[PDB]
Write a protein that binds this ligand. Structure first.
Ligand SMILES: CN(CCOc1ccc(C[C@@H]2SC(=O)NC2=O)cc1)c1ccccn1
Length: 271
C-alpha cells in the first residue's frame, strides 16, 4: 500500500543521505555557483593539472600516487582510488535496503559485484555537466576536453560516461529519486550466478512500485519519467561492459596494469 511505499522511499533517501557525502544537491550547487566558500579549481590542461597537484601538496599527504608516472595513468589510478571509496559507501547503502542483508551472502556479493559500477556511473552523472566533472569532493573540476586529450586508450574512457550523463541529467532527477533508483539497480535478479532469484525479484518489485510512486508524486508533470528512467538501465549496463572491454585492452597492451585488490575482487569474472 501507498503509506508503506512512501515510508520505504524515505528510509532509502535517509540512508542515501548518510552513505554518500557528495549528493546531487550539493554537487549542482557547486557547479552552479552557490555555496559561498570556494570555487572549484579547474584542470583544463597540463599546466593546471600541475598547479592542482601542487596545491594538494601544500596540504597534508594522503596514501595515493604522488607522480613520477605518466599523467594518463595517475588520473586512471585516481579514479580507481575514488572507486574503492565508492564501493564502501555503496555497500553500506546496499545493506540499508530492506531485505538485502537477509539474502544469501553469496548473492549479496554477486549483486554488489555487478551493481557497484552501474551505481558509480549513475552517481558520477550528478557531478557532471556537458563540459566537465567534479573531483576531490567538489574541490576540483576536470574538463571533458582535458580527459579526452589523454593518450588514446585513456583518452576515451570518460567520454561514454559524459555522453550517458548528459542524457541522464536531462531527466532532472533529485536525490530522493536517485536513492530508490540505485536500490532497484542493486536488486537485479538477472545477475550471473545468482542462487535465489525469487527473493531478489520480490524485493525489486516493491522497490519498483516505490520508485513509480516517487516519480509520480515528486514529478507530476514529467510524462513517462518512470519508463524513461528504467531504459537508462540499458545504457548503464552498456557503459560497464564497454569499460570492462577497455580494461582488457589495457591489460593486454600496457606494460603492466595494477588494479586495487578490492577492485580486483569486483572485476574477477564480470560482464
Ligand atoms: C573523481 N574523479 C572524476 C572522474 O571519476 C571517475 C571515473 C571512473 C570511475 C571508475 C573506476 S576507473 C576503473 O578502472 N575502475 C573503476 O571502478 C570512478 C570515478 C577523479 C579524476 C582524476 C583523478 C582523481 N579523481
Amino acid at each position: 500500500e501507498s503509506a508503506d511505499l512512501r515510508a520505504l522511499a524515505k528510509h532509502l533517501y535517509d540512508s542515501y543521505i548518510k552513505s554518500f557525502p557528495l549528493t546531487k544537491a550539493k554537487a549542482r550547487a557547486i557547479l552552479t555557483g552557490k555555496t559561498t566558500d570556494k570555487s572549484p579549481f579547474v584542470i583544463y590542461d597540463m599546466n593546471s593539472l600541475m598547479m592542482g597537484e601542487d596545491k594538494i601538496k601544500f596540504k597534508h599527504i594522503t596514501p595515493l600516487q604522488e607522480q613520477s608516472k605518466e599523467v594518463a595513468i595517475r588520473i586512471f589510478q585516481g579514479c580507481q582510488f575514488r572507486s574503492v571509496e565508492a564501493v564502501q559507501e555503496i555497500t553500506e547503502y546496499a545493506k540499508s535496503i530492506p531485505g538485502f542483508v537477509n539474502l544469501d551472502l553469496n548473492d549479496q556479493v554477486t549483486l554488489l559485484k555487478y551493481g557497484v559500477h552501474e551505481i558509480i556511473y549513475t552517481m558520477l552523472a550528478s557531478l557532471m555537466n556537458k563540459d566537465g566533472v567534479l573531483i576531490s569532493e567538489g574541490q576540483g573540476f576536470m574538463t571533458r576536453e582535458f580527459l579526452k586529450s589523454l593518450r588514446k586508450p585513456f583518452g576515451d574512457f570518460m567520454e561514454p560516461k559524459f555522453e550517458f550523463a548528459v542524457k541522464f541529467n536531462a531527466l532532472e532527477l533529485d536525490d530522493s529519486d536517485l536513492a530508490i533508483f540505485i536500490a532497484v539497480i542493486i536488486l537485479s535478479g538477472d545477475r550471473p550466478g545468482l542462487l535465489n532469484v525469487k527473493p531478489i525479484e520480490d524485493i525489486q518489485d516493491n522497490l519498483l512500485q516505490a520508485l513509480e510512486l516517487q516519480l509520480k508524486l515528486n514529478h507530476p508533470e514529467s510524462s513517462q519519467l518512470f519508463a524513461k528512467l528504467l531504459q537508462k538501465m540499458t545504457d548503464l549496463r552498456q557503459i560497464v561492459t564497454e569499460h570492462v572491454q577497455l580494461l582488457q585492452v589495457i591489460k593486454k597492451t600496457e606494460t603492466d596494469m595494477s588494479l586495487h585488490p578490492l577492485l580486483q575482487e569486483i572485476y574477477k569474472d564480470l560482464y
